[PDB]
Every structure is written in structure tokens, then in C-alpha cells.
Amino acid sequence: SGFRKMAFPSGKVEGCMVQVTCGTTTLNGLWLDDVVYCPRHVICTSEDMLNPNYEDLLIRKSNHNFLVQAGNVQLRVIGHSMQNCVLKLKVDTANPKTPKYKFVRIQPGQTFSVLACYNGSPSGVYQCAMRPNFTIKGSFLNGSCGSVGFNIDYDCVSFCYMHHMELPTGVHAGTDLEGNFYGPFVDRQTAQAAGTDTTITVNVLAWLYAAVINGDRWFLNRFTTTLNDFNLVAMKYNYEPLTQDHVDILGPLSAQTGIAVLDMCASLKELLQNGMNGRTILGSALLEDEFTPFDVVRQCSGVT
Amino acid sequence: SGFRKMAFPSGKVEGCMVQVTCGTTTLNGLWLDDVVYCPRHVICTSEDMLNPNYEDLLIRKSNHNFLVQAGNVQLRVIGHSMQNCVLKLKVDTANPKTPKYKFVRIQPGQTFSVLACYNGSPSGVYQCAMRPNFTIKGSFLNGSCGSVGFNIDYDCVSFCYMHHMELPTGVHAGTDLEGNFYGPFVDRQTAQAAGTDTTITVNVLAWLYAAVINGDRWFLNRFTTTLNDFNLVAMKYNYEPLTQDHVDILGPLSAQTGIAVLDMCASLKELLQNGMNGRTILGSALLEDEFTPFDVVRQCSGVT
Ligand SMILES: COc1ccccc1OCCNC(=O)c1cc(=O)[nH]c2cc(F)ccc12
Ligand SMILES: COc1ccccc1OCCNC(=O)c1cc(=O)[nH]c2cc(F)ccc12
Numbered sequence: 001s002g003f004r005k006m007a008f009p010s011g012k013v014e015g016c017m018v019q020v021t022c023g024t025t026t027l028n029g030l031w032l033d034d035v036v037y038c039p040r041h042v043i044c045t046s047e048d049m050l051n052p053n054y055e056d057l058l059i060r061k062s063n064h065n066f067l068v069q070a071g072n073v074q075l076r077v078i079g080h081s082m083q084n085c086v087l088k089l090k091v092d093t094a095n096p097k098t099p100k101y102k103f104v105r106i107q108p109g110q111t112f113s114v115l116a117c118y119n120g121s122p123s124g125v126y127q128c129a130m131r132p133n134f135t136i137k138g139s140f141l142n143g144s145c146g147s148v149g150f151n152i153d154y155d156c157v158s159f160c161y162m163h164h165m166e167l168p169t170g171v172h173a174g175t176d177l178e179g180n181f182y183g184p185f186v187d188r189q190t191a192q193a194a195g196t197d198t199t200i201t202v203n204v205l206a207w208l209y210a211a212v213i214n215g216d217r218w219f220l221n222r223f224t225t226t227l228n229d230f231n232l233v234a235m236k237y238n239y240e241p242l243t244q245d246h247v248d249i250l251g252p253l254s255a256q257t258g259i260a261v262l263d264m265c266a267s268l269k270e271l272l273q274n275g276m277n278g279r280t281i282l283g284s285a286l287l288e289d290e291f292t293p294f295d296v297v298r299q300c301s302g303v304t
Numbered sequence: 305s306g307f308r309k310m311a312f313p314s315g316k317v318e319g320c321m322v323q324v325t326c327g328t329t330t331l332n333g334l335w336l337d338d339v340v341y342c343p344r345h346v347i348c349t350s351e352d353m354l355n356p357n358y359e360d361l362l363i364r365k366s367n368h369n370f371l372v373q374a375g376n377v378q379l380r381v382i383g384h385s386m387q388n389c390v391l392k393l394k395v396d397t398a399n400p401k402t403p404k405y406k407f408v409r410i411q412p413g414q415t416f417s418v419l420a421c422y423n424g425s426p427s428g429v430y431q432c433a434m435r436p437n438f439t440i441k442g443s444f445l446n447g448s449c450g451s452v453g454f455n456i457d458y459d460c461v462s463f464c465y466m467h468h469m470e471l472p473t474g475v476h477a478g479t480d481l482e483g484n485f486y487g488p489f490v491d492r493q494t495a496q497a498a499g500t501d502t503t504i505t506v507n508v509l510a511w512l513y514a515a516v517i518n519g520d521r522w523f524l525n526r527f528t529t530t531l532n533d534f535n536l537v538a539m540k541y542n543y544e545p546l547t548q549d550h551v552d553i554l555g556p557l558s559a560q561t562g563i564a565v566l567d568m569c570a571s572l573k574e575l576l577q578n579g580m581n582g583r584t585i586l587g588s589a590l591l592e593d594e595f596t597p598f599d600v601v602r603q604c605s606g607v608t
Contacts, residue, residue, distance in 0.1 A: 004443035006420070006429065006443060009429055011313075115313060116310070118608045123606060126311065137587065141605070142606070143606060144606070214474070276589075300445070302446070
């Protein structure tokens, strides 16, 4: 029993973190096989970040300008290339600690663990969600760039995120491991609109199921609703519209608790309309949306 | 910017987790040097747990009865001993992955990361606090016993907790690494009163400083208070009394923000008396007490 914002064990990712320096800028890199991946803004200076011409800045750089250090050992750089907003530095040694891995592009609403790093050294690990507007509400300071987001299935690490920047609004933006930004963001020091965010409805419902499994059931009511009625409430409260695909993913949790998905929607509807009345659910005084149905089943079953 | 319930990177601890089986019971063990530490209830059967006579149960066991497996390799057990509520199984091989480590007994109110494990395999990592009543509000299922709590300073892992049980109330109890339980708990399947818990006042104030550092400042007011006045409010709301030692630990955060400790106490006083009025602080709709002043400075400075 109990429910926590649990991150994946970061061990397999820690063994991949390196420091990358180019000129005066130092950030984090990800060493997998004989390649080191890092944000391309490592080649910029303060005067450049306002509107950098990355093709031009990279042309002034040579392999010997990218200093890559894995703990205390120096890696020899034998190739460099820019793919989208990431740099790929080919090194002469394959990382002996490379786990089985995949590069995946996550969907908005999905979750992942972040291993915050500074100067190539892991500082901490936390779980978060990719917001519907493609931002992440992370915890990152100066030098955190290049820290990565990932999920772990059995022995395989799926890397889904690399950290690039903090928007003026204090929210975070980054890319997949092929250097494509999530959302409309560009790696430039400019005002960037993160559009309207919404609450991840399927995750809130999954968390309500987790609450019931753990004994918090005060919010369960005598009502039911329909997808149409519920979605009118979802619209009013800036919640993502619930689809039959979301109901289908909630199937196993509906089966485990015996609470029909639409009945749980009616509990959520009453909580949106009346609030919590000073009560809590799983130690929270608000509706939590950072746990997917998969996360709930994983935590409630003990998948290692 | 941003503030997250950040756990330490679990890598150094993952390399220590093993599976320990005795008879029909399997749980987790901690392999450090040539010793494996695990909860002594691994030697019990269902009929025993109601009131086990551990001295007697252990006498029926021999070294060859404790099956210890580190991933896929079997460890040879050459000695066994019970120290308080832990068993120490001496093995013939020192763990090659043993990090620099200490065994520490944490104080109530302090925090640590937990690496939840099942069958000797890490499933997830989360940060938590040792409650003032010596329980932890963890996330643990069947087979989680032997999972450990720890803090990391530089390259040194300080182990402070080993998981033993879930009380009928759904809260968690365990020992230090010398097998002494935190609190009045015994490793018996019986009703056990976890006394009155309180909110960790110094941690709430530390979290209010973290909020100010990150831009959430709506709760700052034109008032001040005294330790005496504040403690009358703390008493009424089941908060730990604030002492000059707590004020002293908040010194650096008071210096960084320029907000006097007693002025922050007056903000906390108004929040206790008026509530949040439907607002949030650092994404929370309640007063968070799982971040120490040390945690706040660490996260806000980037200590790796
Ligand atoms: C506006 O800056 C950039 C824009 C596009 C691309 C790159 C940009 O910065 C590169 C450096 N960034 C960091 O090291 C950084 C990341 C972060 O998430 N939080 C921070 C908090 C701080 F107080 C200071 C810095 C950071
Ligand atoms: C009452 O049990 C004991 C009492 C004293 C000592 C040991 C006791 O149990 C030993 C086994 N315990 C677990 O594996 C366990 C731990 C936990 O934190 N959550 C759980 C949730 C479950 F649904 C089932 C089991 C657990």
C-alpha cells in the first residue's frame, strides 16, 4: 500500500552521463555505444544565444574543440555532426556501461523519469509528465542542459527527452534523442509561447483508481455519467476530452476495482464541480495528473 | 527553476541489491563488502508472524538454508547472525560494486530516498521523510521488505533505513542498518499504535523559502511574529514547535531571500489560519513538509 511519485531506478542512465565542454560552455552529454549526444547550444556564446546561426557556429568547431569527460577520463572525439538540435560526437571508445536502449518520441500526457545532471554528474531523479502543450515542469538550474528523460522496461532504457532550456515562464523545453523539439520551441533565447495547457484526464482517472486501490474512497459517489456529459465538464475545467481509447486503457483498472470507467468519470465530475472540501486524496489536495494508467498498474503490481 | 520531490540517483544502491530466500519466503538483501543485510522475518512462516520467537526460528536454520542471489549469480553463505531485527549473512565474496558507505540513524523530520525492490530487483525510487512518529508513508507491496533508504554525499552512501513492514493503518515501519526499529514498532503481525504525528515545521518553512526562490510569493505578507506566538499556532495545527536550532538551520535560506525567519513564520501562520483559498504553492494545494532546509539548498544550488 501507499502511492508515490516514483521514478525509475537511474543506474543504467548514470553510467551514460558525461560532461561536454566547447569553448566556455559546459553541459551534459549521453554516451551510448561510440556516440555522445548533447544539445547543440553547447557551441554558443552569450552574444549568440539571442539568435544563433548553428550551421555557422559549428563550422568554426573541430573534433578537438569538444572536450568530453566521463568522470575522470577523457574521450577522444573522432567525428561531429548536428542532427536537428542535437550534436552527435563520435568517440573512439564504446561506453562499456551502455545498457540496452531505444530512442523514442513520447506522446503528450505520457510520463518519464529525469536524471538531473551537472558537469556530467547525476544530482537527482524525479518523475514527471510531458504536458499536453509539450513542456515539462521540471527542476533544472544552470548547467542542467543535456540531462535526459527515460522509461525502463525490463533491461531496456527508452530515452525520450533531452533538456535544452527554460522558457521565461519557468517551464522546461527539450528534444527527443534525434534533436527534434517537443512542441513549437526553438533553441533561441527569445519569448516563446507555450500554448494553453490542459489537465491529463486519463491520468487523473488512473490516479483515482490508485486512490481506491489504496483505501482513499471518500470521493466515490452514487452517480454515473456519459462521455458526452463528462466532456462538457472537462471542457469547462480545461481537462483533455476523454475518448473511448482512454476508456479502453483504463479497462484493467476498471476490472481490478470493479468501478466502471463512466462511474469514476462521475466521481471526477463531482470533484471538478465541488472541489475537495478541504480533504485529500493520496496525500494530495489537488487532482494529480502525472500518473498514467500504466504507471498505476506498475506501482500497484510491483513490476521490476 | 522549478521544484520537485527529487530522489538521489539510485545507481550506487542498485549494485548492492540481492534476493534472499529462506524456506518459502523471499525478500531483498543489501550486499556490502562480504555481508548481506536483510530483515530477520525472512525466517518466518505465516503461522509464525503472529508472535515469532526469532531466536528459536534462527536455530533451525543453517548457512545453506539462506539462498542469496545477486542477479543471476549465487552467493555462498559462510556465516549467519542476528543483530536486533536484521540478519547478517556473511558471504565468501565481497560485492565488487560496494560503494563508499556509512550506516546512519536518521532523526525524525529528516528525508531520504527509498529504492523499492522486489526479488532483489529495483523497481523504483522515491523521496520521503521519516515522520515525527517514526513511520514512513511509503509505497511498498508484498516482497518489498529489505528495500533500503539512503542519502548520498559526494561518493558516500549513508544507509539509514531498511523496510520491514506495513502497519494495519497502511503506513510503513523499518529499522536502521543495525536492525533497530525506528519508533516503538516490533516485527510481529499485531496491532501497533503509531502515535500522534505532527507536521515538520522546519521543512514547511524551508519549502516556503523554495517557493519564494522559484517565484511563488503570493503568500508573503506584511506581518511578523515571535517564536512564542508562532508556537501557539503550531500547537493548534499539530505542527512541531519551532526552536532556535530550527531558525539557525533556516539561516542560509533567510540570507538568500532576505526574508527573516520570523517573517516567514508569520506567512505560515496566516496560511495555517486561512488556508490556501484555492491557490497553490510549487504545484501543491497543501503545505509540504518532505523537504529539509538542506534539501532546498541542494536542489536550488545543483549539488551532484
Ligand atoms: C534562455 O536560455 C536558452 C534558450 C535556448 C537554448 C538554450 C538556453 O540556455 C542554455 C543554458 N540554460 C541553462 O543552463 C538553464 C536551463 C534550465 O532549465 N534552467 C536554468 C536556470 C537558470 F537559472 C539558469 C540557466 C538554466
Ligand atoms: C504484517 O506483516 C508483517 C509484520 C511484521 C513483520 C513482517 C510482516 O510482513 C512481512 C511481509 N510484508 C510485506 O511483504 C509487505 C510490506 C509492505 O510494506 N507492504 C505490503 C503490502 C501487501 F499488500 C502485502 C505485503 C506487504
